[PDB]
Short mmCIF file of C-alpha atoms in Angstrom, two decimals:
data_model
loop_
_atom_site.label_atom_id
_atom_site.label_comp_id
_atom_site.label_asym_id
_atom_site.label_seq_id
_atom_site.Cartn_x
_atom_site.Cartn_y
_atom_site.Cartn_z
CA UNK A 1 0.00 0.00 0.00
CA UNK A 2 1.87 2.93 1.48
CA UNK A 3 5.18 0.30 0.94
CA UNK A 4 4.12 -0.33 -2.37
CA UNK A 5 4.37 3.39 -3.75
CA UNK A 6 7.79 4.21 -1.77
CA UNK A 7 9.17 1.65 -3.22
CA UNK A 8 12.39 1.35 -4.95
CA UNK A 9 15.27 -0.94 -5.44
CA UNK A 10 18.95 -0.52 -4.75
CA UNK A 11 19.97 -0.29 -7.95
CA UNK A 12 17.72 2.70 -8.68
CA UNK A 13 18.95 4.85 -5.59
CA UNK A 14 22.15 5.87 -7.57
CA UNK A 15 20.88 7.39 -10.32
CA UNK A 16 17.78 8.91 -8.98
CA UNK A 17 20.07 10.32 -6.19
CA UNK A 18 22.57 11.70 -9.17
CA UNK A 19 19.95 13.71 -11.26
CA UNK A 20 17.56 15.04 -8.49
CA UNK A 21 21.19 15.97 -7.11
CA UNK A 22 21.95 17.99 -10.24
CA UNK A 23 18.70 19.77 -10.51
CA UNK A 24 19.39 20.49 -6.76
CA UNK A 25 22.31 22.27 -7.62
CA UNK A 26 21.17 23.88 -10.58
CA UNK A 27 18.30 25.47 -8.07
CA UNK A 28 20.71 26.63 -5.46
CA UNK A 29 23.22 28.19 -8.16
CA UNK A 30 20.51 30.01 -9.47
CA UNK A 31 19.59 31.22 -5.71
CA UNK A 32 23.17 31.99 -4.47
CA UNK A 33 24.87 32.91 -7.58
CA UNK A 34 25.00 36.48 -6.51
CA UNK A 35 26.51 35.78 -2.85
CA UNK A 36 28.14 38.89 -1.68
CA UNK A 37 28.77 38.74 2.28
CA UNK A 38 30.51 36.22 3.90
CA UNK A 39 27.31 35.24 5.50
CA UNK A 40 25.81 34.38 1.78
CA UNK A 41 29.35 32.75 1.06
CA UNK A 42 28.75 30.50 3.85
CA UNK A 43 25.27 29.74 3.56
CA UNK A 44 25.87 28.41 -0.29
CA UNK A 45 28.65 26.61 0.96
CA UNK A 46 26.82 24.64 3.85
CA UNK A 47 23.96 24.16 1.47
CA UNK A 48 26.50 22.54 -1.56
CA UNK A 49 28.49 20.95 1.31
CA UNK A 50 25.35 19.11 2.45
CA UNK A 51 24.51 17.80 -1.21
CA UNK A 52 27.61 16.69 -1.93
CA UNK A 53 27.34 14.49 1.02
CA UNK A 54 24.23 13.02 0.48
CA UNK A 55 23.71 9.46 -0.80
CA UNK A 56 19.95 8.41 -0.49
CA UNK A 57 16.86 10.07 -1.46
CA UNK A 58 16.12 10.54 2.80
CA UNK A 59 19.08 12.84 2.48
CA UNK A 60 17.68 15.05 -0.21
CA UNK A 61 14.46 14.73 1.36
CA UNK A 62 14.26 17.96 2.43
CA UNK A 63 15.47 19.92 -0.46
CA UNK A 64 13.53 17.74 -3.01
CA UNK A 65 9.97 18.95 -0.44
CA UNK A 66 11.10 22.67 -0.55
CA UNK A 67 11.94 22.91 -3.82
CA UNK A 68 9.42 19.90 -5.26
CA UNK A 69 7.58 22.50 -7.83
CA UNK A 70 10.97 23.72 -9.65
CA UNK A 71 11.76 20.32 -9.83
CA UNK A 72 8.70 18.70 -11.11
CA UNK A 73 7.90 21.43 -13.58
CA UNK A 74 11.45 22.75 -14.82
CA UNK A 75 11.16 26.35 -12.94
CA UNK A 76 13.84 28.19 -11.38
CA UNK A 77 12.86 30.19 -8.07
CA UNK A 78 14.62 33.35 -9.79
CA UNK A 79 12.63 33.57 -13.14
CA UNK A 80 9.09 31.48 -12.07
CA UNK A 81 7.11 34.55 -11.89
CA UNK A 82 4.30 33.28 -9.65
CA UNK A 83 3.48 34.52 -6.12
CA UNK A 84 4.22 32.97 -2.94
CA UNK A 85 0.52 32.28 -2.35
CA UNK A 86 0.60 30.45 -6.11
CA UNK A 87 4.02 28.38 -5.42
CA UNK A 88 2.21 27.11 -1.64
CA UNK A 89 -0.74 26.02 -4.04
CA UNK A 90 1.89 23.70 -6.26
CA UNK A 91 3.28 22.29 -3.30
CA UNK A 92 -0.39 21.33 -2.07
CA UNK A 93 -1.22 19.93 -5.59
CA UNK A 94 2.28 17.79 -5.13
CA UNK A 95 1.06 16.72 -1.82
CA UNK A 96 -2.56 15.89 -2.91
CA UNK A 97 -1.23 14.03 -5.94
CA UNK A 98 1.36 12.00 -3.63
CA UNK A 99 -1.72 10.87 -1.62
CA UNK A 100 -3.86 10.50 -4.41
CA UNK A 101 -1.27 8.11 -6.34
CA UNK A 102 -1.08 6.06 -3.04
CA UNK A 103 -4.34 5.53 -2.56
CA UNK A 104 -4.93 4.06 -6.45
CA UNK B 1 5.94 11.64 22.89
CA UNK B 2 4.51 14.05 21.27
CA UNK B 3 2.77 16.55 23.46
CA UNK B 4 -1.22 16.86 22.50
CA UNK B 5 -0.87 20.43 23.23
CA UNK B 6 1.53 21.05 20.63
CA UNK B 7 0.32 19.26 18.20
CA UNK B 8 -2.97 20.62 18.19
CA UNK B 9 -1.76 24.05 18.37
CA UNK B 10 0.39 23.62 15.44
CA UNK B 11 -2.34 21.85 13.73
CA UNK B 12 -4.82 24.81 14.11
CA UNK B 13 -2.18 27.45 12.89
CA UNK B 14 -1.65 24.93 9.49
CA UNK B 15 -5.07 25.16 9.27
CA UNK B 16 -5.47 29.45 9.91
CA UNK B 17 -2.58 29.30 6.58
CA UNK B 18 -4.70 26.90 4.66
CA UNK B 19 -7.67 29.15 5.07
CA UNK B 20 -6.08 32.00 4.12
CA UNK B 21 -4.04 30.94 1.33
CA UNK B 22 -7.15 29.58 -0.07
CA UNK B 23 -9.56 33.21 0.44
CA UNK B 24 -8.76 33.83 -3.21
CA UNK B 25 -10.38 30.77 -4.60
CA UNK B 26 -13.47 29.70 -5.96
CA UNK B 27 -12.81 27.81 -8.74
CA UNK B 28 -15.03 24.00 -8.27
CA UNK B 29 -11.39 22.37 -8.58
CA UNK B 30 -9.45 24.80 -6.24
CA UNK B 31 -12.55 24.30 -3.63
CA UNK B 32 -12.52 20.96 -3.53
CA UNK B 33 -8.57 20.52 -2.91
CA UNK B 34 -9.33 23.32 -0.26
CA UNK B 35 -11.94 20.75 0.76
CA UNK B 36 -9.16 18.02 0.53
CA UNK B 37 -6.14 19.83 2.50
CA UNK B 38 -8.29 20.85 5.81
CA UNK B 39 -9.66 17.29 6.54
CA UNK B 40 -6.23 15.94 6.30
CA UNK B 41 -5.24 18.56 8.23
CA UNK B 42 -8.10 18.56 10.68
CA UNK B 43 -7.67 14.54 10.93
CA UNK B 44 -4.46 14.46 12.08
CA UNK B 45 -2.90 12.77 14.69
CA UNK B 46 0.68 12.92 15.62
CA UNK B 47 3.19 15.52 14.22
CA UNK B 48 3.98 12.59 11.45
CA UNK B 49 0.84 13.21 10.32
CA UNK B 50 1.64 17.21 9.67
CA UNK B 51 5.07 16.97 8.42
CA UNK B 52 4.70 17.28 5.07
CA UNK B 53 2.36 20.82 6.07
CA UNK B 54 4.71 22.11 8.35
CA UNK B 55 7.66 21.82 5.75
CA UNK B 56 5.63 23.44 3.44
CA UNK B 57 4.36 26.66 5.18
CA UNK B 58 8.01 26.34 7.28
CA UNK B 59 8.35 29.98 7.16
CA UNK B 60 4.97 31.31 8.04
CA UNK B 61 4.47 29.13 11.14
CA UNK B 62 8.33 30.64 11.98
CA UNK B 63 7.23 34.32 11.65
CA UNK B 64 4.15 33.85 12.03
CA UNK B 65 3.19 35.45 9.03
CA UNK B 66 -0.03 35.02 6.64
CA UNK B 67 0.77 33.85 3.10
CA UNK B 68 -1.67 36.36 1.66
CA UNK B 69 -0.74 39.51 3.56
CA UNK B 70 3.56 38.56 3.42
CA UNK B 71 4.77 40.83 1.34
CA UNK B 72 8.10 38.39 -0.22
CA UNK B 73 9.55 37.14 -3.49
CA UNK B 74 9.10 33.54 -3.94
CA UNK B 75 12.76 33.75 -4.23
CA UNK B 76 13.22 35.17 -0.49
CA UNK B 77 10.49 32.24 0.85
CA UNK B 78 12.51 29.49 -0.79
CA UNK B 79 16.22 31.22 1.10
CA UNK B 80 14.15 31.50 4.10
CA UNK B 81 12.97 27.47 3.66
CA UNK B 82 16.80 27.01 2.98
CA UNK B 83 17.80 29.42 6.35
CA UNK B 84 15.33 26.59 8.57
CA UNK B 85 16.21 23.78 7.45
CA UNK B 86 20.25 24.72 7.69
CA UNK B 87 19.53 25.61 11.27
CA UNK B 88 17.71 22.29 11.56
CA UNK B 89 20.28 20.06 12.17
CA UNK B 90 22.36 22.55 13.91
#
C-alpha cells in the first residue's frame, strides 16, 4: 500500500540520487549565484556541502519537499514569476497528488 | 511523545494558513482541494501526520506570518525554507 508506492530498489537509488542531485544544484546556483557577504558565502557553501554528502533520497528529502515544484515542472525560483501564495498552491497539488497516487 | 498540546496548536495554525491561502479561490477544482487539504489537516494525529504541512508553510508558522498579507519574493520564501532547514540540524 503505502510500501508499495515508496518503493524502490537498490539499484535505482544511484541514479535517482545523481539527477535530483543535479537539478538540486542547478536550483541553489541560481539562488546563491549572486553571494556577496561572507554570510551568503557560507550559507551556499553549507547548502552545496550538504549535497555533496548526500547518498539516499532521505538525504535530499528535504530539499527535493522545498523545492518539489521547480523540480517537477522545470522552474527556477529566480525567473518562475508566480506569487508565494501560487508556489504554496503547487506544493499542495504535489502533496494531494502523492496521496492520491497512493491511494490508487 | 509528542505533546497533545503542541500538536494541536500547530495543527490549528496549518489550518489558519490553509484558510487564508485559499480566500482567493473559488474555482469547483481549487474548492474541492481546499476541501481536501483541511480534513487531512483537521484529521491528524501525531506531528507525522503534519510533516509534510509544516515543511511546506516552514516559514509562516516561523514568523508567524499570513501567506496572503507577506509581502516576499518567492525567491526570499525558498532562502528563508533554505535558512530553517540549515539551522535544523544545527
Amino acid at each position: 500500500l503505502r510500501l508499495h508506492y515508496t518503493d524502490q530498489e537498490k539499484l535505482d537509488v544511484p541514479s535517482l540520487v545523481e539527477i535530483c542531485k543535479q537539478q538540486l544544484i542547478v536550483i541553489l546556483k541560481d539562488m546563491c549565484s549572486d553571494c556577496s557577504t561572507t554570510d551568503e558565502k557560507t550559507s551556499f557553501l553549507y547548502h552545496l556541502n550538504r549535497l555533496r554528502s548526500a547518498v539516499t533520497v532521505v538525504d535530499l528529502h528535504n530539499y527535493i519537499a522545498v523545492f518539489g515544484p521547480c523540480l517537477s515542472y522545470n522552474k527556477l525560483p529566480s525567473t518562475w514569476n508566480i506569487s508565494v501564495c501560487d508556489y504554496l498552491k503547487q506544493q499542495l497539488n504535489i502533496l494531494r497528488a502523492a496521496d492520491s497516487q497512493q491511494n490508487a
